[PDB]
RNA sequence: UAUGAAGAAGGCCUUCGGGUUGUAAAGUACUUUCAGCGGGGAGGAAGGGAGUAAAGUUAAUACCUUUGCUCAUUGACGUUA
């Protein structure tokens, strides 16, 4: 019952994230390969911090399921209910 | 909820041989309490009103009183329980 499925788990991302937490938040197989993935795509470092849109771009590169959460939703829900 | 050892990745500790997070997760079967969407549906209502009957009262079959029977009705809660 063990297929060869690659990492495809759902991952929630915040507004501003960094490499150190991103290492285990996605749990990708290439522990350093994940680190090189950013350093290759654009100028980036060990401690570099990316944004939620850039984080969505990253998750697209990894291909795992992506979830975007931002704090402004509270205003959006109120706006939606308006008649 | 039951099953679930590739005792998986990733983390951490490592006497780098391993241990642990751990049946935990993933996968495979089973169920829908509550919320959500529709349908149905108690109890809180006792009464009061209109006729009609008989008893009681009187000059009086009237009017009034006591007891029936019959008819239509009384809920903010409330889209109730
Ligand atoms: K391990
Ligand atoms: Mg319900
Ligand atoms: Mg009753
Ligand atoms: Mg009732
Ligand atoms: Mg009498």
UniProtKB/Swiss-Prot annotation:
Subcellular location(s) per record: Cytoplasm
Protein family per UniProt: Belongs to the TRAFAC class translation factor GTPase superfamily. Classic translation factor GTPase family. IF-2 subfamily.
Coiled-coil ranges per UniProt: none
Lineage: Bacteria, Pseudomonadati, Pseudomonadota, Gammaproteobacteria, Enterobacterales
Disulphide bond pairs: none
Protein name per its UniProtKB record: Translation initiation factor IF-2
Parts of the chain that traverse the membrane: none
Superkingdom of origin: Bacteria
Function: One of the essential components for the initiation of protein synthesis. Protects formylmethionyl-tRNA from spontaneous hydrolysis and promotes its binding to the 30S ribosomal subunits. Also involved in the hydrolysis of GTP during the formation of the 70S ribosomal complex.
Species, as recorded: Escherichia coli O139:H28 (strain E24377A / ETEC)
Parent-protein residues present: 300 to 382 of 890
